[PDB]
Design an enzyme around this catalytic site. Structure first.
Site, PDB file in Angstrom:
ATOM      1  CG  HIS B  83      12.199   4.765  29.834  1.00 27.60           C
ATOM      2  ND1 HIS B  83      13.380   4.965  29.158  1.00 27.60           N
ATOM      3  CD2 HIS B  83      11.238   4.665  28.890  1.00 27.60           C
ATOM      4  CE1 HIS B  83      13.144   4.970  27.861  1.00 27.60           C
ATOM      5  NE2 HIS B  83      11.852   4.787  27.672  1.00 27.60           N
ATOM      6  CG  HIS B  85       8.422   4.034  27.152  1.00 25.57           C
ATOM      7  ND1 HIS B  85       8.942   5.231  26.715  1.00 25.57           N
ATOM      8  CD2 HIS B  85       7.241   4.330  27.742  1.00 25.57           C
ATOM      9  CE1 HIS B  85       8.116   6.208  27.031  1.00 25.57           C
ATOM     10  NE2 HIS B  85       7.075   5.690  27.653  1.00 25.57           N
ATOM     11  CG  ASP B  87      11.770   1.447  23.231  1.00 26.13           C
ATOM     12  OD1 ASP B  87      11.091   1.771  24.217  1.00 26.13           O
ATOM     13  OD2 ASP B  87      12.512   2.238  22.620  1.00 26.13           O
ATOM     14  CG  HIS B  88      14.022   1.116  26.652  1.00 23.16           C
ATOM     15  ND1 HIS B  88      15.163   1.116  25.881  1.00 23.16           N
ATOM     16  CD2 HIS B  88      13.303   2.191  26.258  1.00 23.16           C
ATOM     17  CE1 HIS B  88      15.137   2.152  25.065  1.00 23.16           C
ATOM     18  NE2 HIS B  88      14.023   2.822  25.278  1.00 23.16           N
ATOM     19  CG  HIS B 224      16.910   4.548  21.988  1.00 22.12           C
ATOM     20  ND1 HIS B 224      16.275   3.785  21.036  1.00 22.12           N
ATOM     21  CD2 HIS B 224      15.990   4.785  22.951  1.00 22.12           C
ATOM     22  CE1 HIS B 224      15.026   3.573  21.405  1.00 22.12           C
ATOM     23  NE2 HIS B 224      14.829   4.168  22.563  1.00 22.12           N
TER      24      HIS B 224
HETATM   25  O1  3C7 Z   1      12.696   9.255  20.374  1.00 21.22           O
HETATM   26  C1  3C7 Z   1      12.753   8.369  21.235  1.00 21.22           C
HETATM   27  O2  3C7 Z   1      13.154   8.545  22.362  1.00 21.22           O
HETATM   28  C2  3C7 Z   1      12.408   6.924  20.864  1.00 21.22           C
HETATM   29  C3  3C7 Z   1      12.713   6.726  19.410  1.00 21.22           C
HETATM   30  S1  3C7 Z   1      11.138   6.341  18.720  1.00 21.22           S
HETATM   31  C4  3C7 Z   1      10.127   6.946  20.020  1.00 21.22           C
HETATM   32  C5  3C7 Z   1       8.765   6.314  20.330  1.00 21.22           C
HETATM   33  S2  3C7 Z   1       9.256   4.712  20.845  1.00 21.22           S
HETATM   34  C6  3C7 Z   1      10.692   5.256  21.678  1.00 21.22           C
HETATM   35  C7  3C7 Z   1      10.334   5.309  23.144  1.00 21.22           C
HETATM   36  S3  3C7 Z   1      11.849   5.462  24.066  1.00 21.22           S
HETATM   37  N1  3C7 Z   1      10.984   6.618  21.165  1.00 21.22           N
HETATM   38 ZN    ZN Z   2      10.797   5.632  26.072  1.00 21.86          ZN
HETATM   39 ZN    ZN Z   3      13.182   3.719  23.724  1.00 22.01          ZN
END
Ligand code: 3C7
Ligand code: ZN
Ligand code: ZN
Ligand code: 3C7
Ligand code: ZN
Ligand code: ZN
Lengths: 266, 266
Positions: B83, B85, B87-88, B224
């Site tokens: 997805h 976001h 962080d990906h 994750h």
């Molecule tokens: O809980 C989640 O899925 C994670 C960990 S911290 C939170 C906000 S950032 C990231 C987007 S995938 N997200």
């Molecule tokens: Zn996300």
């Molecule tokens: Zn994430």
């Protein structure tokens, strides 16, 4: 074990983020941004124009000041930009979502705006902001007319490729006031000579100094007010010490020549 | 006088930013991201595929690990995403500039990627990154084949509208290994019920739990790694405790039901 660095936010002097009430410049023209970032509201009988919005987090303050001026979100028709850096185009995407406004810009500013200031020729990804799309592309010298105020684009490439001065004629005391909103002529930390991402940088800046010197210019305003010696916090004297367009261009050119000499020495 | 707040950078746990060497998952498939963010490299005789890149500042580390694997920038053909976001998909724009890679994504992920994660349905502009354009739009169940490895998209909307699981068959010890890279099923701080920006959020999540439960799934990986009980720092035991797709979906659904009950109570 050393992790990669955290992302660093684009932080600025507090005065850049200090809200101010609307400050009238001429009969139809108001400064509605912060103490140290220009955002000009031009009100006409056929809608309003905003020239620049400042930083991303200024959107709501801008909308408050418009409201104080009688301008609802649907009344805002047009956003124009000096250049598409984060501290001037920052809230444009959000303003488009929250108002009727459409953006007109030149191609260079449109492509930089559309990538939210990322892959900047000099800053890389250090100063990014929410991306936005232009609705109209303007050419050098093209006019846009709103509620009968006529805005003319004057390209002045250098600070960014798409840097633009906007000029229009307002009134005060029954007499015309030719307002020139000239863009930045600074080159902060830029590699000026032999820059592979901007090979004709120096020629463009020289041309831009001449463009700015020649603008129709009873009153000069700049995106950073200190560049033209405006003091928005000084009330009735805010514009008293403002530079002419000629003086602004001359000072920028002398600074630029100093920077070139320093670059050669370093 | 109180100025507007500074912009706040998107900061994360240090483990998310901790570089690791390439960790082999199957004959053609490697984890090349950080200790706590997945970035999967799939190498074929006809180029490489990257599935996710992690955070924006991981671009160079990814390129180093590709090089360590024998993959030059021109060999990287395709970027796929779980997805969009920060962080990906964070380094996707930069990877496109620095490699041959083209992006394939569904329409929802493409539009979110193109606005660099701004105007997120839940986060607003809190978690943005450099925007990038998709080169190919994929539909649910569509296949993309590279160097003869066949990737299938399985939409699993909820975490974002465009959340996708990707599946492919690799080998190990001469036997097929059906790998399922399932997206996040979390809803961190989300308003689940009666959300005007996502009215069918709950129905989409329920459908997505069923999608994930049914994936071809000898080995589950998640963006994750802790979500599927991977421990990338644990070497030969990194995947030992990994969940099945069924267990992952069941755990996400139980957590989701708890969150709904809590939302009703709060
Ligand atoms: O809980 C989640 O899925 C994670 C960990 S911290 C939170 C906000 S950032 C990231 C987007 S995938 N997200
Ligand atoms: Zn996300
Ligand atoms: Zn994430
Ligand atoms: O020197 C400049 O022109 C200003 C002041 S601080 C420097 C970097 S941010 C902003 C972009 S216009 N810039
Ligand atoms: Zn600038
Ligand atoms: Zn500026």
């Amino acid at each position: 074990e050393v992790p990669l660095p955290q992302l660093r936010a684009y932080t600025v002097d507090a005065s850049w983020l200090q809200p101010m009430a609307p400050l009238q410049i001429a009969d139809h023209t108001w400064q509605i941004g912060t103490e140290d970032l220009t955002a000009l509201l031009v009100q006409t009988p056929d809608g309003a124009v905003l020239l620049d919005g400042g930083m991303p987090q200024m959107a709501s303050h801008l909308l408050d000041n418009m409201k104080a001026r009688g301008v609802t979100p649907r009344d805002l028709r047009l956003i124009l930009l000096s250049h598409a850096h984060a501290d001037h185009a920052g809230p444009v995407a959000e303003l488009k979502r929250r108002t009727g406004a459409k953006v007109a810009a030149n191609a260079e500013s449109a492509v930089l705006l559309a990538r939210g200031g990322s892959d900047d020729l000099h800053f890389g990804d250090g100063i990014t902001y929410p991306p936005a799309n232009a609705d109209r592309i303007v050419m050098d010298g093209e006019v846009i007319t709103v509620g009968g105020i006529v805005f003319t684009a004057h390209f002045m490439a250098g600070h960014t490729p798409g840097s633009t001065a906007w000029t229009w004629t307002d009134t005060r005391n029954g007499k015309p006031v030719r307002i020139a909103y000239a863009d930045s002529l600074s080159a902060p930390g830029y590699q000026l000579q032999g820059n592979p991402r901007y090979p004709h940088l120096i020629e463009d800046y020289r041309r831009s100094f001449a463009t700015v010197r020649a603008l129709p210019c009873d009153v000069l305003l700049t995106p950073h007010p200190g560049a033209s010696n405006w003091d928005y916090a000084a009330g009735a004297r805010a514009g008293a010490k403002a530079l002419t367009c000629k003086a602004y261009a001359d000072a920028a050119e002398q600074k630029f020549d100093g920077q070139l000499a320093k670059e050669t020495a370093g």
